[PDB]
Amino acid sequence: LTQPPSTSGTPGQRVTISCNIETNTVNWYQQLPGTAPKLVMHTNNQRPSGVPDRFSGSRTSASLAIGGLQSEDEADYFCAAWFGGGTKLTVLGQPKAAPSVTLFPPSSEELQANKATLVCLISDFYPGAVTVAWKADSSPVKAGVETTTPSKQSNNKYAASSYLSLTPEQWKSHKSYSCQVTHEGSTVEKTVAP
Amino acid sequence: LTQPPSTSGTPGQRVTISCSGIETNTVNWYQQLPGTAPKLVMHTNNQRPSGVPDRFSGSRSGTSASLAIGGLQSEDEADYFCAAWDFGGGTKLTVLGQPKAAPSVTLFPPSSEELQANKATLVCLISDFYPGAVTVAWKADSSPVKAGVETTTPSKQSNNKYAASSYLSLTPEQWKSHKSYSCQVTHEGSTVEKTVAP
């Protein structure tokens, strides 16, 4: 069972995945990253419940047609009969979306534990690429930064977070700290203070 | 089919993977290395397909199942799925490549600026852990909460340990009605639980 390893389409379109079998029937599985494979097609053409009507399958070869392409259809699709390699389906032309930024100062609990951490929460953006710079007062912060790789979430938009570690004495010695998130050549800045 | 989120071992050990639910029906086990299609490694409780090594052995006791992997070898790091009739969530199996490390867990109350916008979000920061797999459970006062919970998938930071964060979206009325909120992180079978209060 060999499959094309990738394919793509734009929302509203119709895409199909191509795929011992001449006698037996073919099943299809949809798998999202970090998730168990989910059956979406039965004895060539019967859908499990919960699978939308947009999905139809047909059958030495077998095919999975996906109608009215949506962002949530982005996935790996495997052929199976009595598994194929896989087909990663990419939904292109999804809308751009600027990020939501929320900056959290160190809590009284942490500062009492003689530590201090700031979190810059970044969510609800697309595409999944950002850059982060920090600022102490108005000056660059060049030490103690980590920014996670953005991962797609339920709402089909990306989320990441950047954190900064300081001593309590630094967080008070300054007047404010700032987190600046650049997404598609447009920047958003948030500031917190003691 | 309940199935533990993650497990781990070092080369040469015997590692087992559990699966529970299935008393009147058999269980299959699937191996999926990164970037590959799921492969059948065990059917009808304990029947090894052709090219599976002897060291894989399936069993089933009561209404629970198990897959044991003897002589753990680096080519076995993968996801393992159990699949019975009337698919488990999976188990991430890691062949330890560095010393295990338990996560730092830091919980934040909502920020001053976002309340003035009718938003109240909690953040549970999770850093410095290996292997890179955790599960997060939020609780309001003493009650489970899943409405509005989003967790980022972990990524390797500069100390070669992993980091992630879970965040809870609430209104300010939810945030002010409860006496406390809790974040619990489970890693390598252990839990840590931090708590906040307005």
Compute the C-alpha angle B190/B191/B197, nearest 5°: 170
- Tell me if residue B186 falls in helix, strand or coil: strand
- Tell me if residue A74 falls in helix, strand or coil: coil
List phi, psi (to 5°) of B144.
Answer: -60, 145
Q: Which residues of A touch B165 (CB under 8 A)?
A: 119, 121, 148, 161
Cα B150 from Cα B166, distance rounded (Å): 6
Going from the C-alpha of A142 to that of each of A131, B32, B126, B163, the distances in angstroms are 14, 41, 22, 20
CB B6 within 8 A of CB B94: yes
The first and second tokens of residue B121, run together, are 């979000």
Q: Which of B125, B124, B127 is nearest to B158 (CA)?
A: B127
DSSP assigned state of B48: -
Which residue in chain B is spatially nearest to A106 when comparing CA positions?
A: B108
CB A1 within 8 A of CB A81: yes
Cα A41 from Cα A56, distance rounded (Å): 8
Judge whether B123 is closer than 8 Å to chain A, CB to CB: yes
Pairing mode of beta strands A75-81, A26-31: antiparallel
Which residue in chain A is spatially nearest to B104 when comparing CA positions?
A: A117
Q: Is the CB of A78 less than 8 angstroms away from the CB of B121? A: no
Beta-carbon contacts of B71 under 8 Å, excluding residues fewer than 6 positions away, are B12, B14, B55
Q: DSSP letters along B141-174, please? A: TTEEE-TTEEEPPPEE-TTS-EEEEEEEEE-HHH
B175 membership: H or E segment, kind and range: helix B172-177
Cα A66 from Cα A14, distance rounded (Å): 6
Q: Which of A106, A157, A154 is nearest to A130 (CA)?
A: A157
Bridge partner residues of A47 (DSSP): none
Identify the CATH class of A95-194: mainly beta
Judge whether A99 is closer than 8 Å to chain B, CB to CB: no
This PDB structure is determined at a resolution in Å of: 2.5
B98-198 topology per CATH: Immunoglobulin-like (2.60.40)
Q: Is the CB of B37 less than 8 angstroms away from the CB of A78? A: yes
* Residues in B 24-53 with any Cβ partner in A closer than 8 A: 36-39
Q: Which residues of B touch A142 (CB under 8 A)?
A: none
Q: Is the CB of B106 less than 8 angstroms away from the CB of A83? A: no
Q: How many residue pairs bridge chain A and chain B with CB atoms within 8 Å of each other? A: 89
A1-94 topology per CATH: Immunoglobulin-like (2.60.40)
CB B32 within 8 A of CB B39: yes
CATH 2.60.40.10 boundaries in chain B: 1-97, 98-198
Q: DSSP letters along A151-174, please? A: EE-TTSSEEEEEEEEE-HHHHHHS
Bridge partner residues of B155 (DSSP): B163
The first and second tokens of residue B48, run together, are 């090894």
Q: Which residues of B touch A150 (CB under 8 A)?
A: 152
Q: What technique determined this structure?
A: X-ray
Which residue in chain B is spatially nearest to A100 when comparing CA positions?
A: B114
Q: How far is B35 from chain A (nearest CA, A)?
A: 9
Cα B119 from Cα B112, distance rounded (Å): 10
A75 membership: H or E segment, kind and range: strand A75-81
CB B48 within 8 A of CB B29: no
Q: Strands, E, within chain B: which ranges?
A: 6-9, 15-20, 28-32, 39-42, 56-61, 64-69, 78-83, 91-95, 104-108, 120-129, 135-140, 143-145, 149-151, 155-156, 162-170, 181-187, 190-196
The first and second tokens of residue A135, run together, are 């600022």
Cα B62 from Cα B45, distance rounded (Å): 12
Sign of CA dihedral B182, B186, B187, B189: positive
Sign of CA dihedral B164, B184, B176, A115: negative
Classify residue B105 by burial, with Cβ atoms within 10 Å: 0-12, 13-18, 19+: buried
Q: How far is A68 from chain B (nearest CA, A)?
A: 26
Question: B1-97, superfamily in CATH?
Answer: Immunoglobulins (2.60.40.10)
Q: How far is B191 from chain A (nearest CA, A)?
A: 20
CATH 2.60.40.10 boundaries in chain A: 1-94, 95-194
Classify residue B133 by burial, with Cβ atoms within 10 Å: 0-12, 13-18, 19+: buried
Give residue A156's Cα distance to chain centre: 6
The first and second tokens of residue B180, run together, are 């406390």
Cα A74 from Cα A137, distance rounded (Å): 42
